[PDB]
Amino acid sequence: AMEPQVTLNVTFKNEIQSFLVSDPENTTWADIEAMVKVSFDLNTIQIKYLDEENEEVSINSQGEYEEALKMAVKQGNQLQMQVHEG
Ligand SMILES: [Cl-]
């Protein structure tokens, strides 16, 4: 303990931003969604991530977020995320 830094590489269309998140166990999904919305100027979003099955899967909740981070720890402390609006 605790989880170390995670990198969120977030694509919106042809734009990508990487967010360094120092202590992911100390973050909520709401904080993360807010950062993404502010970065890309979006109101309603849907975020998805590449899992170990190489499948794009929705994060819609704190729970889903914490499961994504468990996996990021296995995958060199980073997540590939895709944002779509609506
Ligand atoms: Cl939303």
Side-chain angles (χ1 to χ4, degrees), residues 47-78:
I47 302 168
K48 283 187 190 175
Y49 79 95
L50 200 54
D51 68 6
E52 274 165 27
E53 279 152 316
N54 310 303
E55 214 80 277
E56 297 290 327
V57 286
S58 272
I59 308 186
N60 305 289
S61 80
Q62 180 60 32
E64 285 171 354
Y65 175 56
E66 300 192 8
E67 294 296 299
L69 295 172
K70 284 174 189 200
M71 193 220 63
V73 169
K74 298 191 251 271
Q75 303 202 326
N77 298 307
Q78 71 197 291

Side-chain angles (χ1 to χ4, degrees), residues 1-30:
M2 275 168 67
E3 196 175 331
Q5 226 213 317
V6 69
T7 303
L8 317 183
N9 297 308
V10 185
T11 296
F12 181 57
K13 308 185 180 282
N14 293 110
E15 192 179 332
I16 183 152
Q17 290 198 70
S18 304
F19 298 99
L20 294 191
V21 170
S22 292
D23 179 10
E25 265 187 67
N26 207 37
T27 68
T28 62
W29 181 237

Side-chain angles (χ1 to χ4, degrees), residues 33 37 43-46 86:
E33 276 210 308
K37 278 169 188 199
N43 231 271
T44 319
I45 66 165
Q46 180 51 236

